[PDB]
Design an enzyme around this catalytic site. Structure first.
Site, PDB file in Angstrom:
ATOM      1  N   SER A   1      -5.555 -15.044   5.771  1.00  0.00           N
ATOM      2  CA  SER A   1      -5.105 -14.368   7.500  1.00  0.00           C
ATOM      3  C   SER A   1      -4.069 -14.595   8.342  1.00  0.00           C
ATOM      4  CB  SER A   1      -6.260 -13.753   8.025  1.00  0.00           C
ATOM      5  OG  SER A   1      -6.050 -13.514   9.465  1.00  0.00           O
TER       6      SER A   1
ATOM      7  N   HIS B   1      -7.251   1.350   3.069  1.00  0.00           N
ATOM      8  CA  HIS B   1      -6.803  -0.506   2.929  1.00  0.00           C
ATOM      9  C   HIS B   1      -5.442   0.170   3.932  1.00  0.00           C
ATOM     10  CE1 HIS B   1      -6.588  -4.641   3.144  1.00  0.00           C
ATOM     11  NE2 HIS B   1      -7.375  -4.728   1.407  1.00  0.00           N
TER      12      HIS B   1
ATOM     13  N   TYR C   1       0.975  -0.997   0.421  1.00  0.00           N
ATOM     14  CA  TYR C   1      -0.191  -0.179  -0.544  1.00  0.00           C
ATOM     15  C   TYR C   1       0.665   1.447   0.126  1.00  0.00           C
ATOM     16  CZ  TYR C   1      -4.147  -3.784   1.212  1.00  0.00           C
ATOM     17  OH  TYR C   1      -4.381  -4.226   0.805  1.00  0.00           O
TER      18      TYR C   1
ATOM     19  N   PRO D   1     -11.641   0.160  -0.339  1.00  0.00           N
ATOM     20  CA  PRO D   1     -12.596  -0.645  -0.345  1.00  0.00           C
ATOM     21  C   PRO D   1     -13.521  -0.093   0.404  1.00  0.00           C
ATOM     22  CG  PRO D   1     -11.397  -2.111   1.444  1.00  0.00           C
ATOM     23  CD  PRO D   1     -10.330  -0.714   0.977  1.00  0.00           C
TER      24      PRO D   1
ATOM     25  N   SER E   1     -10.487 -12.553  -2.352  1.00  0.00           N
ATOM     26  CA  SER E   1     -10.544 -12.377  -1.028  1.00  0.00           C
ATOM     27  C   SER E   1     -11.891 -12.672  -0.719  1.00  0.00           C
ATOM     28  CB  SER E   1     -10.443 -11.321  -0.260  1.00  0.00           C
ATOM     29  OG  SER E   1     -11.162 -10.094  -0.356  1.00  0.00           O
ATOM     30  N   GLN E   2     -11.752 -12.715   0.849  1.00  0.00           N
ATOM     31  CA  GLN E   2     -13.384 -13.443   1.708  1.00  0.00           C
ATOM     32  C   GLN E   2     -13.365 -13.011   2.683  1.00  0.00           C
ATOM     33  OE1 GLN E   2     -15.044 -16.813   4.335  1.00  0.00           O
ATOM     34  NE2 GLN E   2     -14.354 -17.647   3.135  1.00  0.00           N
TER      35      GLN E   2
HETATM   36  C1  LIG Z   1     -10.069  -5.384   2.331  1.00  0.00           C
HETATM   37  C2  LIG Z   1     -10.753  -6.591   2.444  1.00  0.00           C
HETATM   38  O1  LIG Z   1     -12.008  -6.483   2.316  1.00  0.00           O
HETATM   39  C3  LIG Z   1      -9.826  -7.565   2.367  1.00  0.00           C
HETATM   40  S1  LIG Z   1      -8.982  -8.074   2.933  1.00  0.00           S
HETATM   41  C4  LIG Z   1      -8.875  -9.721   3.353  1.00  0.00           C
HETATM   42  C5  LIG Z   1     -10.167  -9.576   3.849  1.00  0.00           C
HETATM   43  N1  LIG Z   1     -10.089 -11.552   4.064  1.00  0.00           N
HETATM   44  C6  LIG Z   1      -9.420 -12.571   4.671  1.00  0.00           C
HETATM   45  O2  LIG Z   1      -8.150 -11.936   5.433  1.00  0.00           O
HETATM   46  C7  LIG Z   1      -9.599 -14.048   4.949  1.00  0.00           C
HETATM   47  C8  LIG Z   1      -9.539 -14.000   6.158  1.00  0.00           C
HETATM   48  N2  LIG Z   1     -10.235 -15.480   6.059  1.00  0.00           N
HETATM   49  C9  LIG Z   1      -8.849 -16.755   6.080  1.00  0.00           C
HETATM   50  O3  LIG Z   1      -7.909 -16.456   6.280  1.00  0.00           O
HETATM   51  C10 LIG Z   1      -9.814 -17.829   5.963  1.00  0.00           C
HETATM   52  O4  LIG Z   1      -8.321 -18.966   6.867  1.00  0.00           O
HETATM   53  C11 LIG Z   1      -8.761 -18.437   4.577  1.00  0.00           C
HETATM   54  C12 LIG Z   1      -8.461 -18.800   3.991  1.00  0.00           C
HETATM   55  C13 LIG Z   1     -10.032 -17.530   3.708  1.00  0.00           C
HETATM   56  C14 LIG Z   1     -10.604 -19.527   4.855  1.00  0.00           C
HETATM   57  O5  LIG Z   1     -12.050 -19.920   5.610  1.00  0.00           O
HETATM   58  P1  LIG Z   1     -11.899 -20.575   5.943  1.00  0.00           P
HETATM   59  O6  LIG Z   1     -13.172 -20.412   7.371  1.00  0.00           O
HETATM   60  O7  LIG Z   1     -11.216 -21.870   6.849  1.00  0.00           O
HETATM   61  O8  LIG Z   1     -13.390 -21.413   5.234  1.00  0.00           O
HETATM   62  P2  LIG Z   1     -14.042 -22.779   5.224  1.00  0.00           P
HETATM   63  O9  LIG Z   1     -13.263 -23.539   5.170  1.00  0.00           O
HETATM   64  O10 LIG Z   1     -13.824 -23.404   3.541  1.00  0.00           O
HETATM   65  O11 LIG Z   1     -14.854 -22.866   5.795  1.00  0.00           O
HETATM   66  C15 LIG Z   1     -14.962 -23.192   7.241  1.00  0.00           C
HETATM   67  C16 LIG Z   1     -16.421 -24.169   7.468  1.00  0.00           C
HETATM   68  O12 LIG Z   1     -16.350 -25.433   6.086  1.00  0.00           O
HETATM   69  C17 LIG Z   1     -16.163 -26.765   6.822  1.00  0.00           C
HETATM   70  N3  LIG Z   1     -14.896 -27.303   6.039  1.00  0.00           N
HETATM   71  C18 LIG Z   1     -14.426 -26.949   6.214  1.00  0.00           C
HETATM   72  N4  LIG Z   1     -13.454 -28.359   5.418  1.00  0.00           N
HETATM   73  C19 LIG Z   1     -14.878 -28.843   5.578  1.00  0.00           C
HETATM   74  C20 LIG Z   1     -14.223 -30.485   4.706  1.00  0.00           C
HETATM   75  N5  LIG Z   1     -13.840 -30.785   3.770  1.00  0.00           N
HETATM   76  N6  LIG Z   1     -16.031 -31.250   5.791  1.00  0.00           N
HETATM   77  C21 LIG Z   1     -16.620 -30.921   5.606  1.00  0.00           C
HETATM   78  N7  LIG Z   1     -16.422 -29.296   6.024  1.00  0.00           N
HETATM   79  C22 LIG Z   1     -15.015 -28.802   6.103  1.00  0.00           C
HETATM   80  C23 LIG Z   1     -15.203 -26.101   8.451  1.00  0.00           C
HETATM   81  O13 LIG Z   1     -15.415 -27.253   9.752  1.00  0.00           O
HETATM   82  C24 LIG Z   1     -16.767 -24.513   8.608  1.00  0.00           C
HETATM   83  O14 LIG Z   1     -17.162 -24.906   9.210  1.00  0.00           O
HETATM   84  P3  LIG Z   1     -18.215 -24.058  10.490  1.00  0.00           P
HETATM   85  O15 LIG Z   1     -17.447 -22.859  10.655  1.00  0.00           O
HETATM   86  O16 LIG Z   1     -19.623 -22.867   9.404  1.00  0.00           O
HETATM   87  O17 LIG Z   1     -19.561 -24.984  11.140  1.00  0.00           O
END
Ligand SMILES: CC(=O)CSCCNC(=O)CCNC(=O)[C@H](O)C(C)(C)COP(=O)(O)OP(=O)(O)OC[C@H]1O[C@@H](n2cnc3c(N)ncnc32)[C@H](O)[C@@H]1OP(=O)(O)O
Length: 577
Positions: A410, A308, A75, A88, A510-511
């Site tokens: 993250s 940001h 940034y 954003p 991103s999510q």
């Molecule tokens: C300015 C801006 O807006 C931009 S800045 C960016 C902002 N966003 C971020 O930084 C992203 C933050 N998120 C992360 O770092 C996450 O670790 C990322 C990499 C996105 C992954 O997200 P996760 O929350 O882990 O998603 P994911 O595993 O796919 O889904 C979570 C659910 O999916 C389930 N799950 C995962 N693998 C599964 C499987 N194999 N079988 C059944 N269920 C599964 C988990 O147990 C969990 O259940 P629940 O919590 O809903 O009860």
């Protein structure tokens, strides 16, 4: 800090991963030259190992060995104008304001929410967050919070610079006029009733023709080098220094936008938040250097534009959702400005520069309602991994190729942790997208299913690797800047056309999940790229997609269509037997 320090990945792990990530994204010839380049850089007693040693030393001497490098690379160094390119926007649900008082009452309440949320913050009373999703239970870094209201981004010729006072105050912008609204005397935080009263006064004052001053805010919507120069002009006069100082030291801004013209669609409301619609709408009723700009429009369009550099979407949304869940009186001061023929010229350029950004933004809010997390989980899949694969299939079926992709991972597990990169354009994703789109190959559907799962398997494997500090982007970044410190001429490792391509993220994703009825969005990071922010719910998936009209190759409508189709195909593959 009881948090672990961001790990330093082993050199050879990163170099191998690096090459593996790019092999399928460059020609065979080019790849051969890179293997050789990497081989030398990473050879025993070589340059790589020397930099790694420096990195391990820096790791021990600092809290987070990449904070500086990353913050500048991501940034502070960027020269593009903040609107759309960087800042954003979080759009709140549509409101309904019959009379001006309904708009000002909202703004008043919102401001009271900011105040008490800043109190919990100042007394470290905010509950320490924990991981959820991928690797859950451990404490997370909270530093980003304490950046929400205490930050200002100062422009500089080549590099920007990121950042208590009394009385404590917020700047209210109405009709492109900036006012100073004191919200806390001596720890006395004004009543929601008095904030209302003060706002009526501002609205009234901002409607006086003999007092109307030039739209200085407009200057902050311009390229960072241009704003740095125009600001240098303003700084010559004492009256402007003063007002600037006031803006620099406020909690946030509260923008009372004029009625937008168009329809209040999710897409249009978001446009209004991203760029304000240009100088003829609400484009000047802003000051992008400041961290948070809460918008409370006359018509009901509300949200918060965010700078940001100081924090990421996850933190912002928790604060925002918390804000909304919560939901002798001196007169407010008007900031003075002493313009000259110089400033008049600058405002003109900014006006024209900002019109191009508004004219060039191709944005759309797509809500997929066939299914969501629930269905995906029933397939033994990570929702986010599934959605990431969905996007790859969409890009390929539309553009016939995969490209270096970025996904915010993250790393808040570690001290001052911000984010590292998950490269979703894996080799397993290429084999899946090729099997689905290449009719001639006549790949059996049962085979497509396997490749689908293998793809979702690699995405999840990379994710796990990224969020635990074992990915490769931050690592390479640190090795690059350390070398630069040694000699302005970088090693061939980082001058390699291969390394350069890996960083032009044509697909930036991103999510940002939210429980509320709000959503996040942002512009692409390259002229020929897309910006995809999604919110996966139990039965729906909201997609916010952006691209530039200047690039004939990209199209947000077509890409959204291609996402829908990708999600449908994958549901079909999972429903075979
Ligand atoms: C300015 C801006 O807006 C931009 S800045 C960016 C902002 N966003 C971020 O930084 C992203 C933050 N998120 C992360 O770092 C996450 O670790 C990322 C990499 C996105 C992954 O997200 P996760 O929350 O882990 O998603 P994911 O595993 O796919 O889904 C979570 C659910 O999916 C389930 N799950 C995962 N693998 C599964 C499987 N194999 N079988 C059944 N269920 C599964 C988990 O147990 C969990 O259940 P629940 O919590 O809903 O009860």
């Amino acid at each position: 800090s009881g948090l672990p320090k961001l790990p330093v990945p082993p050199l050879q792990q990163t170099l191998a991963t690096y090459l593996q990530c790019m092999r399928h994204l460059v020609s065979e010839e080019q790849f051969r030259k890179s293997q050789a380049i990497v081989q030398q850089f990473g050879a025993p007693g070589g340059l790589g190992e020397t930099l790694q040693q420096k990195l391990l030393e820096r790791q021990e001497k600092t809290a987070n060995w990449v904070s500086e490098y990353w913050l500048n690379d991501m940034y502070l160094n960027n020269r593009l104008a903040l609107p759309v390119n960087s800042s954003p926007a979080v759009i709140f649900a549509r409101q309904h304001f019959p009379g001006t008082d309904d708009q000002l009452r909202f703004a008043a309440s919102l401001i009271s929410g900011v105040l008490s949320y800043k109190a919990l913050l100042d007394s470290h009373s905010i509950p320490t967050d924990c991981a959820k999703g991928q690797l859950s239970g451990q404490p997370l870094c909270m530093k980003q919070y304490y950046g929400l209201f205490s930050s200002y981004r100062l422009p500089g010729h080549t590099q920007d610079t990121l950042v208590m006072p009394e009385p404590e105050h917020v700047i209210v912008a109405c009709c492109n006029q900036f006012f100073v609204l004191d919200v806390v005397i001596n720890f006395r935080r004004l009543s929601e009733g008095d904030l209302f009263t003060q706002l009526r006064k501002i609205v009234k004052m901002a409607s006086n023709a003999a007092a109307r001053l030039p739209p200085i805010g407009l200057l902050t919507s311009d390229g960072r080098s241009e704003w740095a120069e125009a600001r240098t002009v303003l700084v010559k006069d004492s009256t402007n220094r003063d007002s600037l100082d006031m803006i620099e030291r406020c909690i946030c801004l509260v923008c009372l936008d004029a009625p937008g013209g168009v329809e209040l669609s999710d897409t249009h409301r978001a446009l209004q938040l991203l760029h304000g619609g240009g100088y003829s709408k609400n484009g000047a009723n802003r000051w992008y250097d400041k961290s948070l700009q809460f918008v409370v429009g006359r018509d009901g369009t509300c949200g918060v534009v965010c700078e940001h550099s100081p924090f990421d979407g996850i933190v912002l949304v928790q604060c925002t959702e918390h804000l909304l869940k919560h939901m002798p009186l001196p007169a407010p001061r008007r900031l003075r400005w002493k313009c000259s023929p110089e400033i008049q010229g600058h405002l003109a350029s900014s006006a024209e520069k900002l019109q191009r950004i508004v004219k060039n933004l191709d944005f759309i809010v797509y809500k997929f309602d066939n299914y969501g997390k629930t269905f995906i989980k029933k397939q033994k899949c990570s929702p986010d991994a599934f959605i990431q694969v969905a996007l790859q299939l969409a890009f390929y079926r539309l553009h016939r190729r995969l490209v270096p992709t970025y996904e915010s991972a993250s790393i808040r597990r570690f001290q001052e942790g911000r984010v590292d990169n998950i490269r979703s354009a894996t080799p397993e994703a290429l084999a899946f997208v090729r099997a689905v789109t290449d009719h001639k190959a006549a790949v059996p559907a049962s085979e497509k299913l396997l490749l689908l799962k293998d793809a979702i398997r690699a995405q999840t494997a990379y994710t796990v690797m990224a969020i635990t500090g074992m990915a490769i982007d931050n690592h390479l970044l640190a090795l690059r800047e350390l070398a630069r410190a040694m000699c302005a001429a970088l090693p061939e490792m980082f001058m390699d056309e291969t390394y350069l391509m890996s960083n032009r993220f044509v697909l930036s994703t991103s999510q940002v999940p939210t429980t509320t009825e709000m959503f996040c969005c942002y512009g692409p990071v390259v002229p020929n790229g897309y910006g995809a922010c999604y919110n996966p719910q139990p039965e729906t998936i909201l997609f916010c997609i952006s691209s530039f009209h200047s690039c004939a190759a990209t199209s947000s409508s077509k890409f959204a269509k291609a996402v829908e189709e990708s999600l449908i195909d994958m549901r079909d593959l999972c429903s075979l037997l």
